[PDB]
Amino acid sequence: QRFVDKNGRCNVQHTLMFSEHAVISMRDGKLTLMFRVGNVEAQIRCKLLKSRQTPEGEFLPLDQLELDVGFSTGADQLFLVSPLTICHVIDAKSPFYDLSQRSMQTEQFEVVVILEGIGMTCQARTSYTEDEVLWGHRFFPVISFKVDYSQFHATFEVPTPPYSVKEQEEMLLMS
Amino acid sequence: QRFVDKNGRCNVQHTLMFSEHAVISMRDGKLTLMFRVGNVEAQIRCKLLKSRQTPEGEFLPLDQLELDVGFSTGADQLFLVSPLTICHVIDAKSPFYDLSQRSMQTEQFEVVVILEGIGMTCQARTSYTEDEVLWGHRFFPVISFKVDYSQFHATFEVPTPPYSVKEQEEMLLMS
Amino acid sequence: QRFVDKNGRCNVQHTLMFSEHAVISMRDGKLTLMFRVGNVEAQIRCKLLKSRQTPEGEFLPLDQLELDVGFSTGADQLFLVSPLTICHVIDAKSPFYDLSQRSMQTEQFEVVVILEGIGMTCQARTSYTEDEVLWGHRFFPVISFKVDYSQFHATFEVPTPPYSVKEQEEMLLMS
Amino acid sequence: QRFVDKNGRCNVQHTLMFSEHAVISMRDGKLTLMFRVGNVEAQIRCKLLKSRQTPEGEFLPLDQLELDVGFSTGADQLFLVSPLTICHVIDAKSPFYDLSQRSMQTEQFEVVVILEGIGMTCQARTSYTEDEVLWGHRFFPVISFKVDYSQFHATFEVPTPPYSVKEQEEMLLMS
Numbered sequence: 025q026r027f028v029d030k031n032g033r034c035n036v037q038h039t040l041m042f043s044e045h046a047v048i049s050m051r052d053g054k055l056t057l058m059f060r061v062g063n064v065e066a067q068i069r070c071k072l073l074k075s076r077q078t079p080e081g082e083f084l085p086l087d088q089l090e091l092d093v094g095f096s097t098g099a100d101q102l103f104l105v106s107p108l109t110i111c112h113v114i115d116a117k118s119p120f121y122d123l124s125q126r127s128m129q130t131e132q133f134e135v136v137v138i139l140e141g142i143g144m145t146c147q148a149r150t151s152y153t154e155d156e157v158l159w160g161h162r163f164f165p166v167i168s169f170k171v172d173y174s175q176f177h178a179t180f181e182v183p184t185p186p187y188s189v190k191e192q193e194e195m196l197l198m199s
Numbered sequence: 200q201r202f203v204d205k206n207g208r209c210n211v212q213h214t215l216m217f218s219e220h221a222v223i224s225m226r227d228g229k230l231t232l233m234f235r236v237g238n239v240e241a242q243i244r245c246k247l248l249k250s251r252q253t254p255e256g257e258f259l260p261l262d263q264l265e266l267d268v269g270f271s272t273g274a275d276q277l278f279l280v281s282p283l284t285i286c287h288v289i290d291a292k293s294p295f296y297d298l299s300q301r302s303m304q305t306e307q308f309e310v311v312v313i314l315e316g317i318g319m320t321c322q323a324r325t326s327y328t329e330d331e332v333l334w335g336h337r338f339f340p341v342i343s344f345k346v347d348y349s350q351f352h353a354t355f356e357v358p359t360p361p362y363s364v365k366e367q368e369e370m371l372l373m374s
Numbered sequence: 375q376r377f378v379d380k381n382g383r384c385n386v387q388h389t390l391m392f393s394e395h396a397v398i399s400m401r402d403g404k405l406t407l408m409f410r411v412g413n414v415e416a417q418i419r420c421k422l423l424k425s426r427q428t429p430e431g432e433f434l435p436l437d438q439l440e441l442d443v444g445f446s447t448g449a450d451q452l453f454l455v456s457p458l459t460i461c462h463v464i465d466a467k468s469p470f471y472d473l474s475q476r477s478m479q480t481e482q483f484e485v486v487v488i489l490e491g492i493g494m495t496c497q498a499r500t501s502y503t504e505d506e507v508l509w510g511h512r513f514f515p516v517i518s519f520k521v522d523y524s525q526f527h528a529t530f531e532v533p534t535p536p537y538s539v540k541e542q543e544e545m546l547l548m549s
Numbered sequence: 550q551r552f553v554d555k556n557g558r559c560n561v562q563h564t565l566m567f568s569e570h571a572v573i574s575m576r577d578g579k580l581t582l583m584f585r586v587g588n589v590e591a592q593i594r595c596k597l598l599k600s601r602q603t604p605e606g607e608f609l610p611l612d613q614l615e616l617d618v619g620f621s622t623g624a625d626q627l628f629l630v631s632p633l634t635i636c637h638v639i640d641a642k643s644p645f646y647d648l649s650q651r652s653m654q655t656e657q658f659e660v661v662v663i664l665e666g667i668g669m670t671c672q673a674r675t676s677y678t679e680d681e682v683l684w685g686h687r688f689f690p691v692i693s694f695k696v697d698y699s700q701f702h703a704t705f706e707v708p709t710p711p712y713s714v715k716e717q718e719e720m721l722l723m724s
């Protein structure tokens with residue numbers, strides 16, 4: 025049983041546009057921020073909104089920082105054959121580079137997600153504040169092909185280090 | 200006889216959207232996954248669909264991996280003057296990096312191809328499962344300018360090493 | 375109070391498309407050319423128009439040079455939740471790499487800004503000549519969420535070095 | 550007199566879509582292939598069409614190679630304020646890397662140019678065969694702001710080395 029037929033028809037048997045919560049856990053060896061997207065030129069973009077002071081001392085009430093979700097590999101051009109777990113790999117370039125389970129408790133930010141598709145031209149949006157990002161969680165599978173949307177928003181806790189990627193790299197140079 | 204006149208008209212004399220099979224063989228010194236596309240803003244994208252377990256032990260029922268087909272050079276923006284052989288160069292970044300003629304026998308994957316063009320906005324799709332990807336094959340030419348579509352799907356076997364690109368690089372470090 | 379609700383609605387309470395002047399000052403440790411943008415697929419592009427002679431001796435009456443404003447990070451794909459300060463980081467790749475407060479006094483150039491968005495397809499444009507680019511200035515904040523558009527065009531002077539980025543790097547190699 | 554007013558209107562005073570010939574000469578220290586474009590989301594793309602045999606011995610009747618004309622800098626997103634000289638910088642990545650005035654005499658290729666713009670969605674095309682690419686030529690200026698379209702297609706010869714970029718680099722390693 026293939027997911028897509030030779031002529032292009034999809035063989036997937038199906039409030040469910042974006043998961044209510046986002047999560048941060050390990051996947052393929054990298055601390056990753058993840059959230060789920062349900063349902064031509066379907067592209068996704070993420071911005072991190074936050075108040076901050078530049079080293080120059082300037083206070084930016086609402087600054088927007090980019091959150092890489094496929095822009096450099098084309099992974100942001102989505103094939104919505106079924107629910108997708110969008111991944112933001114936290115690295116030195118990420119605004120979450122020094123975000124730890126601890127700091128999250130006091131952090132204040134808003135991850136805005138923008139999904140655009142098609143002529144049809146539409147825009148779906150969502151937002152994840154710090155309290156809606158769950159450290160140490162992982163999404164339940166939804167594909168069984170059948171999709172169980174009752175598990176769309178569900179996540180569970182898994183063994184995840186509390187330190188940020190920056191702290192992980194620091195502890196490595198020494199050890 | 201030019202292929203395109205000064206004013207832009209094409210001088211090509213013409214179920215034929217995508218070749219029924221894909222192939223893997225050498226071209227310009229690189230192991231390459233190839234398939235043919237027949238017929239504004241005409242762009243092509245490829246996703247590799249497959250079930251896999253992350254090193255974290257998580258099982259992803261249907262994960263989508265990117266398959267580079269011109270995204271970084273602009274080669275994915277197609278000029279459909281006639282049938283085109285789309286090329287995915289298998290390198291360290293490719294999900295097929297360690298795919299060999301042997302492993303293919305037991306592998307399970309699905310290459311999904313998405314072609315979008317134009318206002319017109321349309322989407323053509325296709326799919327290639329492991330059994331529809333022929334190792335050691337090459338496509339017959341279709342351009343003679345006249346296009347012989349009876350050879351569109353035809354491929355023939357050519358001397359091709361059975362090892363994966365990863366194995367090729369390993370055998371090189373030592374030898 | 376979040377900026378964007380879970381369903382995507384924006385919670386911002388609002389001649390105001392582009393700031394009348396642009397500025398050049400330090401932000402996050404980099405000399406930056408900045409201007410403000412007010413109000414799908416909303417993208418911004420900047421071109422530097424100027425007359426110049428190539429080392430070959432050829433005079434180009436009106437040559438267009440690129441001005442990086444997010445093209446390589448996706449920051450040029452705008453989320454117009456409120457007024458945005460567009461940033462062009464002046465580096466070795468920038469046409470303003472050797473622009474100093476001094477040279478500006480004799481320079482002659484025109485920064486053209488092109489904003490495109492959406493179906494809707496529209497184009498807003500503006501222009502900043504050398505006399506409309508203020509060295510040593512910074513924009514006043516407009517977000518308080520409420521936006522005070524009376525401060526949209528307002529800027530004030532701040533302690534800024536008069537030397538160009540190229541001169542900064544030169545003085546560093548030696549010192 | 551600015552080229553563009555604060556509100557975006559252009560101050561330019563105007564068979565003229567593409568120059569009949571292309572040229573290859575030095576500009577800003579680089580051997581460059583150039584051609585002129587006259588007249589939203591206005592983007593240009595170039596493909597090099599040619600018959601060739603792969604080292605594997607395979608003959609490709611009509612292979613398409615990419616010709617970089619701004620794809621990596623955004624310079625391919627055009628601002629048609631007046632006639633533009635499109636530039637393809639010949640480097641190690643260019644299909645013209647080893648093209649010399651000599652080889653051109655026997656070469657056989659076709660540079661296809663594709664211009665797309667906007668809703669409006671249109672496509673203008675053109676083609677330049679080897680005999681329509683003039684080595685050692687430069688375009689006359691058209692901007693004086695007034696545009697003299699009688700000089701649109703005009704080019705003149707200038708002192709240009711006959712060797713290819715590859716040969717230039719070879720002669721450098723030794724000398």
Ligand code: NA
């Ligand atoms: Na479009």
Ligand code: NA
């Ligand atoms: Na890119």
Ligand code: NA
């Ligand atoms: Na890049």
Ligand code: NA
Binds near residue numbers: 143318493668
């Ligand atoms: Na449209």
